[PDB]
């Protein structure tokens, strides 16, 4: 429409929106988490350690609160964790740096100071990034346990340690000469009903639960060859064309059972030509599956065309129409295991594949229906580590001490790179140290004096190598505390926080058309 808002009032309005979001989430961060309680507008209490569940249900304000969800959903899509971490960084830089730089009135040199701050971050980050062995599970077990122990639930953390550390190593690119981080479609989590953690087997490969659910279908074949159309399946799926009577209820029932009867006639070639797995990307009826029991062949239904390529390249399935009339078959083996387990009347087909482009979804078991989801939550924090240790064997220590170490590295380069640049460049260095100060604020001491003891620690002996505890508030070795910071989170969350703070600085006008 016709709408214009004058400058400073909007950029300050960006500050008031983002900082108040950054208030409680900074205290909801880490093992010193608080809980953000939303009272329902229809009555009812909701408190978690995740403000994204809180914010997306409640009325999001317009000026800067809308952009923080957008940078969070990108943060939640990639690694999941750190959505709490991104939003508290940008609003803190938005509050501390901007307001007097608004008085000196320059947007541009602030934006250039973000480019100076991001590059100074990487140089001091790699020097303290410590390589752990990707060929040793216990070197990876120490960091994957650190991400799960943000909660007080640590009983089945080791069950989450066992399955994830070997699956994501098998999840690779389609380029297949490459590692680093897995993709969410190629690494999924689903719960398997019933079961015990003493039967939660380590699955690396892809599971197909649209496979066998009845024991007459395919039993223990090492190459489950998925069979598309054209010799064992044909194109006829219609009707024998009985007469159309508009004044009868039994007419519309007969036309559907005649449709199923030709699907019975398609599977007559499945008896005579003997597949082992047949597929249908349009989905078949359950009554079509009973005649496949007479064929002793499993079905695959409610799937897509791209699901069948990524499994058959992985599990070693040959794309055939007959096993007696072959069609230049695929690889004969890519599978390390063929195992089908049952819960009730539901067989769950597993096949473990080795360094393969599969759309992986792992096995997980708990003890109960609610505690099946607790294992599922633990594997979510597990896969963030397993992609990162695939991404970066090097990684930093820290409990927020690295955030101070980035903050002090800027301050030295603030005094070294003298000029007009240093005043936004030193102001954003002040914004970083507030967050671990708040983590040791919940620990409880003269946290401002500790903040001095943070900085005197940095340049003298150890930047954050000897770091600080964020559950006691004491300067501890973060290598000896066993708590480690994920290096990709140190990459990604800093990259996202500087981009949001640029865009909220550039805006001073909103319209509604």
């Amino acid at each position: 429409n016709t709408k214009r808002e004058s400058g400073r009032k909007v950029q300050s309005g960006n500050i008031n929106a983002a900082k108040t979001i950054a208030d409680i989430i900074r205290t909801c961060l880490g093992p010193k988490s608080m809980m953000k309680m939303l009272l329902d507008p229809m009555g009812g209490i909701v408190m978690t350690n995740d403000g994204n569940a809180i914010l997306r249900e409640i009325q999001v304000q317009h000026p800067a609160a809308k952009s923080m969800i957008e940078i969070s959903r990108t943060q939640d899509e990639e690694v999941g964790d750190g959505t709490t971490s991104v939003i508290i960084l940008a609003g803190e830089m938005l509050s501390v740096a901007e307001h007097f730089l608004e008085q000196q009135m320059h947007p541009t040199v602030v934006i250039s100071a973000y480019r100076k701050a991001l590059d100074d971050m990487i140089s001091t980050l790699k020097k303290i990034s410590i390589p752990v062995d990707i060929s040793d599970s216990d070197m990876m077990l120490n960091i994957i346990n650190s991400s799960i122990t943000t909660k007080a639930i640590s009983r089945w953390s080791s069950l989450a340690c066992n399955i994830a550390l070997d699956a994501v190593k098998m999840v690779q690119f389609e380029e297949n000469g490459r590692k680093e981080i897995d993709i969410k479609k190629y690494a999924r989590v689903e719960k398997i009903p019933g079961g015990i953690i003493e039967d939660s087997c380590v699955l690396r490969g892809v599971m197909i639960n649209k496979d066998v659910t009845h024991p007459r279908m395919r039993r223990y074949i090492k190459n489950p060859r998925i069979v598309l159309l054209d010799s064992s399946l044909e194109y006829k799926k219609g009707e024998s064309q009985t007469d159309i009577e508009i004044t009868r209820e039994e007419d519309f029932t007969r036309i559907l059972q005649m449709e199923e009867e030709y699907i019975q006639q398609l599977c007559e070639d499945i008896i005579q030509l003997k597949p082992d797995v047949v597929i249908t990307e349009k989905g078949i009826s359950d009554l079509a599956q009973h005649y496949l029991m007479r064929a002793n062949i499993t079905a695959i239904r409610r799937v897509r065309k791209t699901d069948n390529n990524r499994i058959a390249r992985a599990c070693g399935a040959r794309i055939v129409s007959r096993p007696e009339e072959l069609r230049e078959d695929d690889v004969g083996t890519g599978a390390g295991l063929l195992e089908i387990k049952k819960i009730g009347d539901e067989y769950f087909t597993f096949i473990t594949d080795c360094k393969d482009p599969k759309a992986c979804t792992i096995l997980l078991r708990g003890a109960s229906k609610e505690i099946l989801s607790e294992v599922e939550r633990n594997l979510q924090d597990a896969m963030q580590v397993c992609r990162n240790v695939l991404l970066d064997p090097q990684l930093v220590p820290g409990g927020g001490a690295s955030e101070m170490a980035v903050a002090h590295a800027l301050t030295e380069k603030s005094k070294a790179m003298t000029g007009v640049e240093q005043w936004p460049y030193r102001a954003v260095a002040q914004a970083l140290e507030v967050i671990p100060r708040t983590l040791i604020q919940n620990c409880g001491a003269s946290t401002i004096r500790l903040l001095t003891s943070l900085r005197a620690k940095h340049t003298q002996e150890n930047c954050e190598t000897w770091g600080v505890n964020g559950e006691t508030g004491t300067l501890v070795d973060m290598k000896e505390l066993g708590i480690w910071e994920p290096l990709a989170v140190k990459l990604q969350t800093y990259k996202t926080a500087v981009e949001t703070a640029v865009l909220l600085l550039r805006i001073d006008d909103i319209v509604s058309g």
């Binding site: 429409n1 016709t2 214009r4 317009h62 809308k66 952009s67 009135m105 320059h106 947007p107 541009t108 040199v109 380029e175 598309l228 159309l229 054209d230 010799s231 044909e234 194109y235 006829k236 799926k237 219609g238 009707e239 024998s240 064309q241 030709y262 006639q265 398609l266 007559e268 070639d269 065309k305 791209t306 069948n308 390529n309 794309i319 069609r327 230049e328 695929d330 865009l503 550039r506 805006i507 001073d508 006008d509 909103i510 319209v511 509604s512 058309g513």
Partner: protein, 534 residues
């Protein structure tokens, strides 16, 4: 709101409604001030309640806005006229006219004849265009100290990927010459969007590679089919050969699947026979488009079926017209029943398959009936290749337009600096009432380098300091003078005395921007009989 609301049509009848629309026009113009130029600020603009967009392109902003004032309205109309011309220069016409429609009602009131202020605007417009044709002081890109290379290197320095742009300078010089697609007048410049630009990630960051002839992005790593045979003849294939589902001839009513089975064994044989009759005709490199299933790909690679599949259609339409090929002279079937003819083939001096950056690409060296060139880049990563792509296209567009107009002008408010001055010097020579028609017009030019400076945090006061310090009174001559200068670089917002940069826009985009910015103040004047309606 000021003025009466008892009458309809929001009529206020006089100085209040003349004070209304100067507020309604300036607020539109104030939006473009934040987003002016490459240093202009991005605005997050909500579309309905949840849909947002981030823009600093003013024409895209005005598409979002819904006018409720004629001062809101005609600024949207005149800016879209320049938008359908180019899309550039639409920012300048909006900001200036808000001051112009403050100045026009004061003086068209003061008629001996009312159009004299308007003709004074047009005389100021024509005084610009004459000296616009007299500009060679700043912005030559048709040559430089070396060549168009000097223009392109500073243009690739204006588009930052670091300190690079040195090897990238030669790409922009080739691009108007590598293309030969017929423009108007048969000019030696040719459109820059027809250039085959390819990426190759992970090598020297400065490095760029020129290829004589067009370069085809063909896939490697999935196909291993015969493609490396060196030829001089190519075949372009809008074709697809599947094994699964290619032929239908039996209805779904017949109760016999055996009839559906026996015609399947004939469709699988003709795909292998199709590539035999193509290779028997005389081709040895064929270029097949995609469209086959994911199950039919894996059979062609390990067993052997000669093709080059899933090639880019955006290159293949260019290369087949470049090499003398036809892709439509034998299409009456999409299966392996017809044979291949000799008129579909392309012509080159040789077709060599060079593997480089671990990627075997098909380089059509010296396409015949038009000899061309292509450029494949060398970055260090994917996103580093993604940055230099956007670094190219703006330098591709600005150099192509300066080759069109021989006389070319500085860009932004740089050219407006002498137009702010020497039109007012021209205004005093006209004498009477029409002087301030030119003078208020030339006064309104000053805000364009000013508001871009604030967006660049340079803040408008050294900008009016330097540009007035250049302009010589004893030497009102621009020619290339060391006694007056007019240039200014906008990406820093500080005057860097340059004439090879990519921030200096040609004559053509500027002279039309002077038309509609003048016309917009004229547009509000065109009323007769301000009334209401019940």
């Amino acid at each position: 709101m000021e003025g009466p609301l008892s009458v309809f049509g929001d009529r206020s009848t006089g100085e209040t409604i003349r004070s209304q629309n100067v507020m309604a026009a300036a607020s539109i113009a104030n939006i473009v001030k934040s987003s002016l130029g490459p240093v202009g600020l991005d605005k997050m603009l909500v579309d309905d309640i949840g849909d947002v967009t981030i823009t600093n392109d003013g024409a895209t902003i005005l598409k979002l806005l819904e006018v409720e004032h004629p001062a809101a309205k005609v600024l949207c109309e005149l800016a879209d006229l320049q938008d359908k011309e180019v899309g550039d220069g639409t920012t300048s016409v909006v900001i200036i006219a808000a001051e112009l429609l403050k100045n026009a009602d004061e003086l068209v009131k003061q008629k001996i004849h009312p159009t004299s202020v308007i003709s004074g605007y047009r005389l100021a417009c024509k005084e610009a265009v004459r000296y616009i044709n007299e500009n060679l002081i700043v912005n030559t890109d048709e040559l430089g100290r070396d060549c168009l290379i000097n223009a392109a290197k500073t243009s690739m320095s204006s588009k930052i990927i670091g300190i690079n742009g040195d090897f990238f300078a030669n790409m922009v010089v080739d691009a108007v010459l590598a293309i030969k697609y017929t423009d108007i007048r048969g000019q030696p410049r040719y459109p820059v969007n027809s250039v085959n630009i390819l990426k190759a990630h992970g090598r020297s960051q400065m490095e760029s590679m020129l290829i004589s002839g067009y370069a085809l992005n063909c896939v490697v790593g999935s196909q291993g089919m015969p493609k490396r045979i060196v030829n001089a003849k190519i075949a372009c294939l809008d074709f697809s050969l599947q094994k699964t589902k290619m032929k239908l001839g039996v209805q779904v009513v017949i109760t016999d699947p055996e009839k559906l089975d026996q015609i399947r064994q004939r469709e699988s044989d003709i795909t292998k026979e199709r590539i035999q009759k193509i290779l028997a005709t005389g081709a040895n490199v064929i270029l097949t488009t995609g469209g086959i299933d994911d199950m039919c790909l894996k059979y062609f690679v390990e067993a052997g079926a000669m093709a080059v599949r899933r090639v880019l259609k955006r290159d293949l339409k260019r290369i087949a017209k470049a090499s003398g090929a036809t892709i439509l002279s034998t299409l009456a079937n999409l299966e392996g029943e017809e044979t291949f003819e000799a008129a579909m083939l392309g012509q080159a001096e040789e077709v060599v398959q060079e593997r480089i950056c671990d990627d075997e690409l098909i380089l059509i060296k010296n396409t015949k009936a038009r000899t061309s060139a292509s450029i494949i880049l060398r970055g260090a990563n994917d996103f580093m290749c993604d940055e230099m792509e956007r670094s190219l296209h703006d330098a591709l567009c600005v150099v192509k337009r300066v080759l069109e107009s021989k006389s070319v002008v500085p860009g932004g408010g740089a050219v407006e600096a002498a137009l702010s001055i020497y039109l007012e010097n021209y205004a005093t020579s006209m004498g009477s009432r029409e002087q301030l028609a030119i003078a208020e017009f030339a006064r309104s030019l000053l805000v364009i380098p000013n508001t871009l400076a604030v967006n660049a945090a340079q803040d408008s006061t050294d900008l009016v300091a330097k540009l007035r310090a250049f302009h010589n009174e004893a030497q009102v001559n621009p020619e290339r003078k060391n006694l007056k200068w007019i240039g200014l670089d906008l990406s820093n917002g500080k005057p860097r005395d340059n004439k090879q940069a990519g921030v200096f826009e040609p004559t053509i985009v500027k002279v039309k921007s002077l038309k509609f910015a003048t016309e917009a103040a004229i547009t509000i004047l065109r009323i007769d009989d301000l009334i209401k309606l019940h």
